[PDB]
């Protein structure tokens, strides 16, 4: 069947506002985590986050940004970058039935959802709400807010699966290409950063709370003293294109998506089973005869989550343990945006031939001994890489990408 | 490729808590719209809705329902119904890598989103929020809350696309079967009914407000005096299964999904373009050598909305227009659940050989001139039906189902 490759990428993350800034942060093991006065004032125990260091005001047409929440803004900016990076002129992707968009978020917009309710209960009622809350608060906000302005005529919808959200978006994009239904599918996601949603995770005990005085050390995947993830926001978008189409226009190809796994744990609600993850990685490796040179793990930085994934990786590769690093130690967990941003970090490592370090590991977890966890930036010729996205609700996605000759 | 058929269904709507009750309401053109004190007390202009008349108290185990929002509850109950109706037992669908679940909601759970914010802002903070808000508030709540209890091991995620949400879910399930990845995929969705979310649509001027005195007449699709849709809640689930697998176990086959259309308008944020709908319908009809006997249109019952679809239908068929009926006139708009529920209504009509009436039409709009709009329950031998789902963001989905030879 049809082959799918990545020909462009765009990103707005806690460690950079474009792929160049991100590249630098990755090589330097630079943290994007900072202290959040907003989270502290909300009454939360976790006072750190991976915020986007950019004032988006005026970066998007007023008539367009009026319908958007932060998730949409981040994804929109990421898509602009992706389009330019892919070298696509407007005439090349706009008003084209074979060009689509699949992008979502983990929670839509709790901020505007609460805003509407707060305004409605106020002295002005509906007048305070406004006619833009729906497009900001709906779960499909990210796809709706981008498909319209970019004149997308092909597939258009959002996929939601918590931490696996944008990973499933990319995989679904691949499926469209494989089915011969689309030539190009923009895939990715975005996530707003707000106490409204963050407090829900803190109320679960899923967020780090013992390192508020040293924010850059809070996210410490695989460290013996990890205590939860650090919430983050941002966006990302990649251009998934059918091979012949990309080659025909002389597109720059980062890699071919040679594997996509999507499975379900069917066990616990908010706790990885590990078993589902093993099946997910094996599914993504079907037909892939080249070894995995680097694995960008889910690596949430949670006590139980980290160990479950470690076990799954051991079961899948056994003696074939590849280089492993959890970029979340640097970036925080962007939820709905994580899958696409992490695929992008993996693509940058593959393109520039280096492995980003898994930082803040002062004491490697006992259940990690024997694995090749990279803790220092290492230059190496990579050919095949894997990125795992295992999210709450027992939903799993794995992407395997490989360089073309 | 592989063929996909529906072997079971389940539904919880404003006009029936199961397919039997729904079937009864459809034949008599009964309305599920009622006066809502909740919507009035909130300060909204629209005081009518399509509530689910059912006491779900104790219908779901404690340990399971504690993670669910109303959208998940309705979806869960619909899935139980679907499993039984399909003749499936745990040994056949549980812990099975080839059985998946694709279901979502349009807005997740505004109610628990606001609940978490309200509780957090209280003196108790995190303690008042509780550790169950995430699974209720997240956009993937519907898929996560069902996949776990039903021990689903295959694909697991939610698709969101406003009014087309559950229609795209069914289409994606078909794709999984065509790709040979799954033998069975439960597809559908759910939507809660609350002022929290309802006020967003009212502030947008999309909800009917000139009939709060005569609820059962508020929703009046294709009527010259329409003034917005009536918000509704509920759930739906269908069992999508690979043909040979279904025949092998002697399952009851309602129909085969012979067409699935998915397009994008890339024009306006909250207004159909028509151009996109036309392409969507043609996409679903492509390859279908059999004519469409019945069409369950979007029929939102909005001034511009209704006009656009009719024009699109006229453009697709023209002089050869099939029987058309807007079930939302009696059921309302269940948003994320509308796609699967309307697919089910179309299946019941196809299964029992009859056409549901388009109630509340005193004066047919001039736009529906050369079209066959059924306003009375008519008995006919249907073979091929079509269901259109066009939501905000310019996202379109069309399903074509036909009896099996
Ligand atoms: N990852
Ligand atoms: N429909």
Curated annotation (Swiss-Prot), chains A, B:
Disulfide bonds: none annotated. GO terms for molecular function: 3-oxoacyl-[acyl-carrier-protein] synthase activity. Its EC number is 2.3.1.41. It is found in: Cytoplasm. InterPro entries: Beta-ketoacyl_synthase, Ketoacyl_synth_AS, Ketoacyl_synth_C, Ketoacyl_synth_N, PKS_Beta-ketoAc_synthase_dom, Thiolase-like. Residues 1-403 form the Ketosynthase family 3 (KS3) domain. It is an enzyme of class 2 (transferase). Belongs to the thiolase-like superfamily. Beta-ketoacyl-ACP synthases family. Homodimer. This is 3-oxoacyl-[acyl-carrier-protein] synthase 1. It comes from Escherichia coli O6:H1 (strain CFT073 / ATCC 700928 / UPEC). The lineage of its organism: Bacteria, Pseudomonadati, Pseudomonadota, Gammaproteobacteria, Enterobacterales. The gene is fabB.
């Amino acid at each position: 069947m049809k082959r799918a490759v990545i020909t462009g990428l765009g990103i707005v993350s806690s460690i950079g506002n474009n792929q160049q800034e991100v590249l630098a942060s990755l090589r330097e093991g630079r943290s994007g985590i900072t202290f959040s006065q907003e989270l502290k004032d909300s009454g939360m125990r976790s006072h750190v986050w991976g915020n986007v260091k950019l004032d988006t005001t005026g970066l998007i047409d007023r008539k367009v940004v009026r319908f958007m929440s932060d998730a949409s803004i981040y994804a929109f900016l990421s898509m602009e970058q992706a389009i330019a990076d892919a070298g696509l002129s407007p005439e090349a992707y706009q008003n084209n039935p074979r060009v689509g968009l699949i992008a979502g978020s983990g929670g839509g917009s709790p901020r505007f959802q609460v805003f509407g309710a707060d305004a409605m209960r106020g002295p002005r009622g509906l007048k305070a709400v406004g006619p833009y809350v729906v497009t900001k608060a709906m779960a499909s906000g990210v796809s709706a807010c981008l498909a319209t302005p970019f004149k997308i005529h092909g597939v258009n919808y959002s996929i939601s699966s918590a931490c696996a959200t944008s990973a499933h978006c990319i995989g679904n994009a691949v499926e469209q290409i494989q089915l011969g239904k689309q030539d190009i599918v923009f895939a990715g996601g975005g996530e707003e950063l707000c106490w409204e949603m963050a407090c829900e995770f803190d109320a679960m005990g899923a967020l780090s709370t013992k390192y508020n005085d040293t924010p850059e050390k809070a996210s410490r995947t695989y460290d013996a003293h990890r205590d939860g993830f650090v919430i983050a926001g941002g966006g990302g978008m990649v251009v998934v294109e059918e091979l012949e189409h990309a080659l025909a226009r002389g597109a720059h190809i980062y890699a071919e998506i040679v594997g996509y796994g999507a499975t379900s744990d069917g066990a616990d609600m908010v706790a990885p089973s590990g078993e589902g993850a093993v099946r997910c990685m094996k599914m993504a490796m079907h037909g892939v005869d080249t070894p995995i040179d680097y694995l960008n793990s889910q690596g949430t930085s949670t006590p139980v989550g980290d160990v479950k994934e470690l076990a799954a990786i051991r079961e899948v590769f056994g003696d074939k343990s590849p280089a492993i690093s959890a970029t979340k130690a640097m970036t925080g967990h962007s939820l709905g945006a994580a899958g696409v941003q992490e695929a992008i970090y993996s693509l940058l490592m593959l393109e520039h031939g280096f492995i980003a370090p898994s930082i803040n590991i002062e004491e490697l977890d006992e259940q990690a001994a024997g694995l090749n966890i990279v803790t220092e930036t290492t230059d190496r010729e990579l050919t095949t890489v894997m990125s795992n996205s295992f999210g709450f609700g027992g939903t799993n996605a794995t992407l395997v990408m490989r360089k073309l000759k």
